[PDB]
């Protein structure tokens, strides 16, 4: 008395598909995004990375 | 090379919405700088391998959540008339977190799974938070009027 396989199954496809993000929150998402895109159309500080100039970018001559 | 090449290109993103999560430039400037100083002694707590932006937001909200938990902060506000007061003057009744889920799923396209990790809830809870957010949007977009009435009677007065 014994048995053996003869079939199989899966739950994935190792693949991906496109999407949409303008038919689930309408233009309201672009309204908020545009108001704060303006916040990125400008310069940035650097004093925060100067806090790294004492632990990840130090140097000494000679 | 170094953290700066993964901090600088996302450095202003903490003010890209911090300007409306506390309503003050003095608070927004000290939160981003206090977020960095809180990592000068624990850079292992600031990974970016999950996403180049998911780690930036986790540490910034950590300082903010510690501020209102000690009275060092209060509810948000605005100082403009068409770029942050617009997000207040029309949504002054949305809960303090569905507004974060809104900027997390209508401005960033991120999945609900990592968006749930960004507010420490389950995936299905983010789905509810955005469903209630868009419901309060489509209902009014500016709350121009209200009418709680709908019925009457004429045999008791």
PDB file of N, CA and C in Angstrom, chain B residues 88-147:
ATOM      1  N   UNK B  88      -6.971  73.468   6.145  1.00  0.00           N
ATOM      2  CA  UNK B  88      -7.503  73.641   7.489  1.00  0.00           C
ATOM      3  C   UNK B  88      -8.924  74.179   7.419  1.00  0.00           C
ATOM      4  N   UNK B  89      -9.115  75.234   6.626  1.00  0.00           N
ATOM      5  CA  UNK B  89     -10.372  75.949   6.506  1.00  0.00           C
ATOM      6  C   UNK B  89     -11.465  75.104   5.845  1.00  0.00           C
ATOM      7  N   UNK B  90     -11.131  73.875   5.433  1.00  0.00           N
ATOM      8  CA  UNK B  90     -12.060  72.983   4.747  1.00  0.00           C
ATOM      9  C   UNK B  90     -12.107  71.605   5.401  1.00  0.00           C
ATOM     10  N   UNK B  91     -11.219  71.344   6.369  1.00  0.00           N
ATOM     11  CA  UNK B  91     -11.059  70.024   6.973  1.00  0.00           C
ATOM     12  C   UNK B  91     -10.831  70.126   8.480  1.00  0.00           C
ATOM     13  N   UNK B  92     -11.245  71.244   9.080  1.00  0.00           N
ATOM     14  CA  UNK B  92     -11.108  71.527  10.506  1.00  0.00           C
ATOM     15  C   UNK B  92     -11.847  70.538  11.414  1.00  0.00           C
ATOM     16  N   UNK B  93     -12.401  69.448  10.864  1.00  0.00           N
ATOM     17  CA  UNK B  93     -13.169  68.478  11.641  1.00  0.00           C
ATOM     18  C   UNK B  93     -12.718  67.040  11.398  1.00  0.00           C
ATOM     19  N   UNK B  94     -11.763  66.826  10.487  1.00  0.00           N
ATOM     20  CA  UNK B  94     -11.206  65.504  10.247  1.00  0.00           C
ATOM     21  C   UNK B  94     -10.291  65.137  11.411  1.00  0.00           C
ATOM     22  N   UNK B  95     -10.295  63.862  11.811  1.00  0.00           N
ATOM     23  CA  UNK B  95      -9.499  63.401  12.946  1.00  0.00           C
ATOM     24  C   UNK B  95      -8.005  63.614  12.673  1.00  0.00           C
ATOM     25  N   UNK B  96      -7.198  63.898  13.708  1.00  0.00           N
ATOM     26  CA  UNK B  96      -5.762  64.151  13.612  1.00  0.00           C
ATOM     27  C   UNK B  96      -4.913  63.088  12.902  1.00  0.00           C
ATOM     28  N   UNK B  97      -5.504  62.005  12.386  1.00  0.00           N
ATOM     29  CA  UNK B  97      -4.719  60.936  11.773  1.00  0.00           C
ATOM     30  C   UNK B  97      -5.225  60.556  10.382  1.00  0.00           C
ATOM     31  N   UNK B  98      -6.512  60.759  10.079  1.00  0.00           N
ATOM     32  CA  UNK B  98      -7.008  60.491   8.734  1.00  0.00           C
ATOM     33  C   UNK B  98      -6.427  61.511   7.758  1.00  0.00           C
ATOM     34  N   UNK B  99      -6.031  62.685   8.261  1.00  0.00           N
ATOM     35  CA  UNK B  99      -5.366  63.694   7.446  1.00  0.00           C
ATOM     36  C   UNK B  99      -3.937  63.270   7.120  1.00  0.00           C
ATOM     37  N   UNK B 100      -3.332  62.421   7.962  1.00  0.00           N
ATOM     38  CA  UNK B 100      -2.001  61.903   7.693  1.00  0.00           C
ATOM     39  C   UNK B 100      -2.114  60.745   6.702  1.00  0.00           C
ATOM     40  N   UNK B 101      -3.167  59.930   6.831  1.00  0.00           N
ATOM     41  CA  UNK B 101      -3.412  58.844   5.897  1.00  0.00           C
ATOM     42  C   UNK B 101      -3.734  59.402   4.510  1.00  0.00           C
ATOM     43  N   UNK B 102      -4.332  60.594   4.453  1.00  0.00           N
ATOM     44  CA  UNK B 102      -4.667  61.241   3.194  1.00  0.00           C
ATOM     45  C   UNK B 102      -3.397  61.641   2.446  1.00  0.00           C
ATOM     46  N   UNK B 103      -2.451  62.294   3.129  1.00  0.00           N
ATOM     47  CA  UNK B 103      -1.197  62.686   2.498  1.00  0.00           C
ATOM     48  C   UNK B 103      -0.279  61.480   2.282  1.00  0.00           C
ATOM     49  N   UNK B 104      -0.686  60.302   2.770  1.00  0.00           N
ATOM     50  CA  UNK B 104       0.098  59.080   2.661  1.00  0.00           C
ATOM     51  C   UNK B 104      -0.432  58.147   1.569  1.00  0.00           C
ATOM     52  N   UNK B 105      -1.589  58.466   0.971  1.00  0.00           N
ATOM     53  CA  UNK B 105      -2.204  57.600  -0.033  1.00  0.00           C
ATOM     54  C   UNK B 105      -2.825  58.385  -1.191  1.00  0.00           C
ATOM     55  N   UNK B 106      -2.705  59.717  -1.182  1.00  0.00           N
ATOM     56  CA  UNK B 106      -3.185  60.561  -2.270  1.00  0.00           C
ATOM     57  C   UNK B 106      -2.097  61.546  -2.710  1.00  0.00           C
ATOM     58  N   UNK B 107      -0.877  61.375  -2.189  1.00  0.00           N
ATOM     59  CA  UNK B 107       0.256  62.249  -2.480  1.00  0.00           C
ATOM     60  C   UNK B 107       1.573  61.482  -2.572  1.00  0.00           C
ATOM     61  N   UNK B 108       1.562  60.166  -2.334  1.00  0.00           N
ATOM     62  CA  UNK B 108       2.798  59.396  -2.286  1.00  0.00           C
ATOM     63  C   UNK B 108       2.650  58.028  -2.958  1.00  0.00           C
ATOM     64  N   UNK B 109       1.412  57.587  -3.215  1.00  0.00           N
ATOM     65  CA  UNK B 109       1.136  56.341  -3.921  1.00  0.00           C
ATOM     66  C   UNK B 109       1.622  55.088  -3.187  1.00  0.00           C
ATOM     67  N   UNK B 110       2.080  55.224  -1.938  1.00  0.00           N
ATOM     68  CA  UNK B 110       2.565  54.089  -1.164  1.00  0.00           C
ATOM     69  C   UNK B 110       1.448  53.080  -0.898  1.00  0.00           C
ATOM     70  N   UNK B 111       1.834  51.819  -0.682  1.00  0.00           N
ATOM     71  CA  UNK B 111       0.903  50.743  -0.376  1.00  0.00           C
ATOM     72  C   UNK B 111       0.336  50.928   1.031  1.00  0.00           C
ATOM     73  N   UNK B 112      -0.831  50.340   1.318  1.00  0.00           N
ATOM     74  CA  UNK B 112      -1.466  50.446   2.621  1.00  0.00           C
ATOM     75  C   UNK B 112      -0.705  49.668   3.697  1.00  0.00           C
ATOM     76  N   UNK B 113       0.193  48.759   3.305  1.00  0.00           N
ATOM     77  CA  UNK B 113       0.922  47.936   4.261  1.00  0.00           C
ATOM     78  C   UNK B 113       2.016  48.743   4.957  1.00  0.00           C
ATOM     79  N   UNK B 114       2.783  49.530   4.196  1.00  0.00           N
ATOM     80  CA  UNK B 114       3.830  50.347   4.786  1.00  0.00           C
ATOM     81  C   UNK B 114       3.237  51.645   5.325  1.00  0.00           C
ATOM     82  N   UNK B 115       2.087  52.062   4.790  1.00  0.00           N
ATOM     83  CA  UNK B 115       1.369  53.201   5.321  1.00  0.00           C
ATOM     84  C   UNK B 115       0.809  52.870   6.703  1.00  0.00           C
ATOM     85  N   UNK B 116       0.487  51.596   6.945  1.00  0.00           N
ATOM     86  CA  UNK B 116       0.006  51.152   8.241  1.00  0.00           C
ATOM     87  C   UNK B 116       1.152  51.109   9.246  1.00  0.00           C
ATOM     88  N   UNK B 117       2.359  50.799   8.770  1.00  0.00           N
ATOM     89  CA  UNK B 117       3.558  50.818   9.593  1.00  0.00           C
ATOM     90  C   UNK B 117       3.942  52.255   9.953  1.00  0.00           C
ATOM     91  N   UNK B 118       3.500  53.238   9.159  1.00  0.00           N
ATOM     92  CA  UNK B 118       3.839  54.635   9.392  1.00  0.00           C
ATOM     93  C   UNK B 118       2.920  55.293  10.427  1.00  0.00           C
ATOM     94  N   UNK B 119       1.864  54.599  10.860  1.00  0.00           N
ATOM     95  CA  UNK B 119       0.978  55.090  11.915  1.00  0.00           C
ATOM     96  C   UNK B 119       0.680  53.974  12.923  1.00  0.00           C
ATOM     97  N   UNK B 120       1.423  52.866  12.828  1.00  0.00           N
ATOM     98  CA  UNK B 120       1.359  51.735  13.747  1.00  0.00           C
ATOM     99  C   UNK B 120      -0.055  51.168  13.914  1.00  0.00           C
ATOM    100  N   UNK B 121      -0.635  50.714  12.798  1.00  0.00           N
ATOM    101  CA  UNK B 121      -1.946  50.068  12.744  1.00  0.00           C
ATOM    102  C   UNK B 121      -1.882  48.871  11.798  1.00  0.00           C
ATOM    103  N   UNK B 122      -3.016  48.202  11.563  1.00  0.00           N
ATOM    104  CA  UNK B 122      -3.085  47.109  10.601  1.00  0.00           C
ATOM    105  C   UNK B 122      -3.413  47.662   9.217  1.00  0.00           C
ATOM    106  N   UNK B 123      -3.121  46.889   8.169  1.00  0.00           N
ATOM    107  CA  UNK B 123      -3.342  47.312   6.791  1.00  0.00           C
ATOM    108  C   UNK B 123      -4.795  47.711   6.566  1.00  0.00           C
ATOM    109  N   UNK B 124      -5.720  46.942   7.143  1.00  0.00           N
ATOM    110  CA  UNK B 124      -7.145  47.159   6.973  1.00  0.00           C
ATOM    111  C   UNK B 124      -7.613  48.428   7.678  1.00  0.00           C
ATOM    112  N   UNK B 125      -6.855  48.927   8.659  1.00  0.00           N
ATOM    113  CA  UNK B 125      -7.238  50.147   9.350  1.00  0.00           C
ATOM    114  C   UNK B 125      -6.915  51.365   8.485  1.00  0.00           C
ATOM    115  N   UNK B 126      -5.828  51.318   7.708  1.00  0.00           N
ATOM    116  CA  UNK B 126      -5.511  52.420   6.809  1.00  0.00           C
ATOM    117  C   UNK B 126      -6.598  52.528   5.746  1.00  0.00           C
ATOM    118  N   UNK B 127      -7.125  51.385   5.296  1.00  0.00           N
ATOM    119  CA  UNK B 127      -8.189  51.362   4.305  1.00  0.00           C
ATOM    120  C   UNK B 127      -9.429  52.068   4.839  1.00  0.00           C
ATOM    121  N   UNK B 128      -9.726  51.889   6.128  1.00  0.00           N
ATOM    122  CA  UNK B 128     -10.857  52.558   6.755  1.00  0.00           C
ATOM    123  C   UNK B 128     -10.577  54.050   6.922  1.00  0.00           C
ATOM    124  N   UNK B 129      -9.351  54.419   7.306  1.00  0.00           N
ATOM    125  CA  UNK B 129      -9.006  55.816   7.529  1.00  0.00           C
ATOM    126  C   UNK B 129      -9.100  56.637   6.243  1.00  0.00           C
ATOM    127  N   UNK B 130      -8.771  56.050   5.087  1.00  0.00           N
ATOM    128  CA  UNK B 130      -8.874  56.782   3.830  1.00  0.00           C
ATOM    129  C   UNK B 130     -10.307  56.787   3.316  1.00  0.00           C
ATOM    130  N   UNK B 131     -11.099  55.767   3.671  1.00  0.00           N
ATOM    131  CA  UNK B 131     -12.496  55.708   3.258  1.00  0.00           C
ATOM    132  C   UNK B 131     -13.290  56.795   3.970  1.00  0.00           C
ATOM    133  N   UNK B 132     -12.978  57.056   5.242  1.00  0.00           N
ATOM    134  CA  UNK B 132     -13.646  58.111   5.986  1.00  0.00           C
ATOM    135  C   UNK B 132     -13.104  59.482   5.581  1.00  0.00           C
ATOM    136  N   UNK B 133     -11.862  59.535   5.092  1.00  0.00           N
ATOM    137  CA  UNK B 133     -11.270  60.793   4.671  1.00  0.00           C
ATOM    138  C   UNK B 133     -11.914  61.282   3.377  1.00  0.00           C
ATOM    139  N   UNK B 134     -12.037  60.405   2.373  1.00  0.00           N
ATOM    140  CA  UNK B 134     -12.627  60.782   1.098  1.00  0.00           C
ATOM    141  C   UNK B 134     -14.133  60.991   1.227  1.00  0.00           C
ATOM    142  N   UNK B 135     -14.761  60.391   2.246  1.00  0.00           N
ATOM    143  CA  UNK B 135     -16.181  60.587   2.480  1.00  0.00           C
ATOM    144  C   UNK B 135     -16.446  62.000   3.000  1.00  0.00           C
ATOM    145  N   UNK B 136     -15.565  62.509   3.869  1.00  0.00           N
ATOM    146  CA  UNK B 136     -15.696  63.862   4.389  1.00  0.00           C
ATOM    147  C   UNK B 136     -15.279  64.891   3.340  1.00  0.00           C
ATOM    148  N   UNK B 137     -14.524  64.476   2.319  1.00  0.00           N
ATOM    149  CA  UNK B 137     -14.143  65.370   1.237  1.00  0.00           C
ATOM    150  C   UNK B 137     -15.307  65.537   0.267  1.00  0.00           C
ATOM    151  N   UNK B 138     -15.836  64.430  -0.263  1.00  0.00           N
ATOM    152  CA  UNK B 138     -16.889  64.482  -1.268  1.00  0.00           C
ATOM    153  C   UNK B 138     -18.167  65.104  -0.698  1.00  0.00           C
ATOM    154  N   UNK B 139     -18.327  65.055   0.628  1.00  0.00           N
ATOM    155  CA  UNK B 139     -19.513  65.557   1.302  1.00  0.00           C
ATOM    156  C   UNK B 139     -19.611  67.084   1.286  1.00  0.00           C
ATOM    157  N   UNK B 140     -18.491  67.806   1.152  1.00  0.00           N
ATOM    158  CA  UNK B 140     -18.538  69.254   1.329  1.00  0.00           C
ATOM    159  C   UNK B 140     -17.390  70.033   0.690  1.00  0.00           C
ATOM    160  N   UNK B 141     -16.164  69.498   0.711  1.00  0.00           N
ATOM    161  CA  UNK B 141     -14.914  70.184   0.355  1.00  0.00           C
ATOM    162  C   UNK B 141     -14.717  71.596   0.934  1.00  0.00           C
ATOM    163  N   UNK B 142     -15.687  72.194   1.642  1.00  0.00           N
ATOM    164  CA  UNK B 142     -15.477  73.484   2.304  1.00  0.00           C
ATOM    165  C   UNK B 142     -16.490  73.791   3.408  1.00  0.00           C
ATOM    166  N   UNK B 143     -17.388  72.848   3.715  1.00  0.00           N
ATOM    167  CA  UNK B 143     -18.392  72.989   4.763  1.00  0.00           C
ATOM    168  C   UNK B 143     -19.148  74.325   4.701  1.00  0.00           C
ATOM    169  N   UNK B 144     -19.468  74.793   3.490  1.00  0.00           N
ATOM    170  CA  UNK B 144     -20.124  76.080   3.286  1.00  0.00           C
ATOM    171  C   UNK B 144     -21.445  76.233   4.045  1.00  0.00           C
ATOM    172  N   UNK B 145     -22.147  75.125   4.307  1.00  0.00           N
ATOM    173  CA  UNK B 145     -23.432  75.135   4.994  1.00  0.00           C
ATOM    174  C   UNK B 145     -23.649  73.805   5.715  1.00  0.00           C
ATOM    175  N   UNK B 146     -24.721  73.733   6.510  1.00  0.00           N
ATOM    176  CA  UNK B 146     -25.108  72.534   7.235  1.00  0.00           C
ATOM    177  C   UNK B 146     -26.620  72.565   7.478  1.00  0.00           C
ATOM    178  N   UNK B 147     -27.247  71.390   7.574  1.00  0.00           N
ATOM    179  CA  UNK B 147     -28.684  71.281   7.795  1.00  0.00           C
ATOM    180  C   UNK B 147     -29.004  69.967   8.516  1.00  0.00           C
TER     181      UNK B 147
END
